[PDB]
Design a protein around this ligand. Structure first.
Ligand SMILES: [Zn+2]
Ligand SMILES: [Zn+2]
Ligand SMILES: [Zn+2]
Ligand SMILES: [Zn+2]
Lengths: 75, 76
DNA sequence: TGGAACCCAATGTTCT
DNA sequence: AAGAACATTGGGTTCC
């Protein structure tokens, strides 16, 4: 199960086990951008169905689960 | 002259309520189609120009609450 | 694993 | 006003 949206947990992307959709969301969130504002209370439910609803909260728990575009762990 | 649903400036009065054009076609699509949306918050999401896209469930709710309806035509 | 390339759903504007 | 057509966005899977 994906540590963010708990969809089809694929295989560690950018440090964390995630679905494919969260993988791509995160690269996009970091590289491009958009300020994402939560419309609730910064604690939205992020599941398969709702991850689309709050990119702010989804992106936040990407960061908190450890996601990073650097697998430079090679050193 | 602001949309009663989302606070973006209203483009006139639609389905019975002062609204912008985004909320106008949003409400029409939701009412005529399916609107089985789920709130990822507590069914009171703030709905402004940007966040209106976040939560269709709370957006539709605010539409109904402000009184929008399709037959506001022959309802006059 | 990472990412280009789709495809697609859902939204917002235009309609000399 | 109401709504069809079109344009775009942002997003999820598919392919290497
Ligand atoms: Zn996920
Ligand atoms: Zn949120
Ligand atoms: Zn509006
Ligand atoms: Zn909501």
């Amino acid at each position: 199960m994906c540590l963010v949206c708990s969809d089809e947990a694929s295989g560690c992307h950018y440090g964390v086990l995630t679905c494919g959709s969260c993988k791509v969301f995160f690269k996009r969130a970091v590289e491009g951008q958009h300020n994402y504002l939560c419309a609730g209370r910064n604690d939205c439910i992020i599941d398969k169905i709702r991850r689309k609803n709050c990119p702010a909260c989804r992106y936040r728990k990407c960061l908190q689960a450890g996601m990073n575009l650097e697998a430079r762990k090679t050193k």
